[PDB]
């Protein structure tokens, strides 16, 4: 049951640390990505007023 | 985006409000002026004896 655990937890942990790390990239992505949407959809909006 | 564009269509709305007015104002004048020329054209009592 000791091996049962080390395997079990160690397993779902490997899969949810996968989960979270992949969204941590996606997350840091979505800031820098909406930061560029900012400047883009701002230059686009700006000469749209003129 | 919004603040800037809000102000846009907003300034225009105002300058095209006084535009709205001037029209309605001038026409109201020309109606009344014509109507004053009309009224005076015939007896200010003739309108009465016609009524």
From Swiss-Prot, chain A:
Its annotated compartments are: Cytoplasm; Nucleus
Modified after translation how?
Answer: Phosphorylated on Tyr residues after EGF stimulation.
Mark the transmembrane ranges. Answer: none
Q: What does this protein do?
A: Required for normal vault structure. Vaults are multi-subunit structures that may act as scaffolds for proteins involved in signal transduction. Vaults may also play a role in nucleo-cytoplasmic transport. Down-regulates IFNG-mediated STAT1 signaling and subsequent activation of JAK. Down-regulates SRC activity and signaling through MAP kinases.
Share what the entry says about its subunit structure, partners included. The vault ribonucleoprotein particle is a huge (400 A x 670 A) cage structure of 12.9 MDa. It consists of a dimer of half-vaults, with each half-vault comprising 39 identical major vault protein (MVP) chains, PARP4 and one or more vault RNAs (vRNAs). Interacts with TEP1. Interacts with PTEN and activated MAPK1. The phosphorylated protein interacts with the SH2 domains of PTPN11 and SRC. Interacts with APEX1. May interact with ZNF540.
Q: What is known of its domains?
A: MVP 3 mediates interaction with PTEN. MVP 4 mediates interaction with PARP4.
Q: What is this protein's name?
A: Major vault protein
The shown range, given as first to last of full length, is 711 to 760 of 861
